[PDB]
Amino acid sequence: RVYPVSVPYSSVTLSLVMP
Amino acid sequence: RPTFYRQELNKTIWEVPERYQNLSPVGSGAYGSVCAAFDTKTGHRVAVKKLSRPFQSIIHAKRTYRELRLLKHMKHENVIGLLDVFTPARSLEEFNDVYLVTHLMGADLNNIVKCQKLTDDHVQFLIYQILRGLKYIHSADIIHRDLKPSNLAVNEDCELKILDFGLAYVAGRWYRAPEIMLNWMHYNQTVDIWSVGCIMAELLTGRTLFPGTDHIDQLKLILRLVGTPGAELLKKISLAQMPKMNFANVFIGANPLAVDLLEKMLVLDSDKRITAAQALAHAYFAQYHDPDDEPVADPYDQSFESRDLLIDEWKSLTYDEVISFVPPPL
Ligand SMILES: Nc1nccc(-c2c(-c3ccc(F)cc3)ncn2C2CCNCC2)n1
C-alpha cells in the first residue's frame, strides 16, 4: 500500500487548532 | 508552609496550596490523573498530576521515586519539566500523596491528527522538536521506550513536549520497535527513533503506519514495508521473502527530503538506524537545525535502579526529593 500526504508537498509561522 | 484546601474530583479528594485555583480534570497520566489549574501566584495555567497509591505496591514506591527523579532532572523546552511538587503532609510520618505540576499544554498529537491535516511545515517543526527532546533525553542515558502520539503534548503555537519518558496498551503496540515487542535483543536508544518514524509517517498521512492487530500481524505489516531482514539480522537474536520498499514510492506527494529521513529512521537493524543527534543535522530540519541551540542534559544518577530497598526507604527517598525541591526562576 502507498500512503500519500494529507497536504501534497509544495515547493510562515505554524499553529494547530485545540480540541 | 502554605495553607491547603480540599475538593473531590472524579470521586477522589485533592489537597493543594491555595495558589492553584479552578482545578479541572483533563484525563489520565502515568500512574495517576491530572487537572488543569490556574496558578494565582504566577498567572499561568498549570497541569497538576496526583499519583495513585505512590507507596502501596513495591513497584509503586519505585515507580513513584523514578518519575520524580526524572522530572526533577529534565530541563528542556520540548521535555515536560516540573514547575512544582508538593504534598499536604507536614512531615515524613504523614507523607502519603504526591502531586506533580507542569505548564498546561492544550493537546496531544493523537487529538491533533484526529481533527486536522498537517503540512510539511507542521511535521517539519513537530518532528524537529521530538528529536531535540530525544537528543537531550538520550544524552542522559534515558530511553523513552514507549514513544507514541499520546505522549507528545502540544500548544496552539505548534510547540511540542515529550512526556512519560523513562517510565516504562493496545495503541502503544503500533509504535514499538520490533526487537522490543518480540524481545529480539537488548534494546538500545534508537528504539525511540523507530517510534519517531512511525509518528512522522502518521503525522504526514493521518493514518497509523503499522496498525498490527496482534503481535504476529504487527511484524507482518512491519516486514511488508521495510523488507526482509538483511545479512546480519538473524545473526542478532521462516516467512515470505519480501523486498524493501523504495520509500519514495509509498509516501506520494511528500517532500523527498522528508522521505529520505523516514528511510534512515525505519531501518530494521538497530545498528543502522539514525540517531536523534544525527537526525537533527539532516537537511529536512535545515530551516530549524541550529547546532548552537540543541543542548545535552547534565549527568543523571540512576544507581537506585539496581537497588532493592524497602518501600519505607523508597518513600523516604521520594520525600527527600519532594522536600529538596527548588522551584525554577520566576
Ligand atoms: N494538559 C496537560 N498538560 C501537561 C501535562 C499533562 C499530562 C501529564 C502530566 C505530567 C506531569 C505533570 F506534572 C502534569 C501532567 N500526564 C499526562 N498528561 C496528559 C496526557 C494526554 N492527555 C491527558 C493529560 N496534561
Numbering used by the authors:
A (entry chain B): 384 to 394, 403 to 410
B (entry chain A): 5 to 172, 182 to 250, 261 to 353
Question: Could you give the paper's own sentences about this structure?
Answer:
TAB1 binding also causes residues Tyr182 to Thr185 to extend into a short α-helical segment, accompanied by hydrogen bond formation between the side chains of Thr185 in the activation segment and Asp150 of the HRD motif. Based on the crystal structure of the p38α-TAB1 complex we replaced threonine 185 of p38α with glycine (T185G) to prevent an intramolecular hydrogen bond with Asp150 from being formed. In our biophysical and crystallographic experiments, we have used a peptide spanning residues 384 to 412 of TAB1 [TAB1(384–412)], and we have previously shown that no other residue beyond this region is involved in the interaction with p38α and that the peptide can recapitulate the behavior of full-length TAB1 in vivo. The mutation of p38α does not affect the TAB1 interaction, and in both structures TAB1 binds in a bipartite manner on the kinase C lobe and induces conformational changes that propagate through p38α: the N- and C-terminal lobes of p38α move toward each other, causing significant closure around the ATP-binding pocket. In contrast to this, in the T185G structure the majority of the activation loop is disordered and not visible (residues 173 to 181); the first turn of the helix from Tyr182 to Gly185 is still present as tyrosine 182 forms a crystal contact stabilizing this arrangement, but the helix has relaxed away from aspartic acid 150 and there is a substantial increase in the B factors of the helix residues. Moreover, the T185G mutation has had a profound impact on both the absolute B factor and B-factor distribution. The center of the T185G mutant complex close to the hinge region is still reasonably well ordered, but there is a strong correlation between distance from the hinge and increased average residue B factor, as opposed to the case for the wt structure. Consistent with these data, we propose that TAB1 in both structures causes the N and the C lobes of p38α to move toward each other, but the key hydrogen bond formed by threonine 185 and aspartic acid 150 is then required to lock the two domains together in the closed state.
Protein p38α is a stress-activated serine/threonine kinase that relays extracellular signals to coordinate cellular responses. p38α is ubiquitously expressed, involved in numerous signaling networks and essential for cellular homeostasis, development and survival (1–3). The kinase activity of p38α is controlled by the phosphorylation of two key residues within the activation segment, Thr180 and Tyr182. Typically, these events are executed in trans by dual-specificity upstream kinases, mitogen-activated protein kinase kinase (MAP2K) 3 (MKK3) or 6 (MKK6). However, under certain circumstances, p38α can autophosphorylate these key residues in cis, an event triggered by binding to a scaffold protein, transforming growth factor β-activated protein kinase binding protein 1 (TAB1).
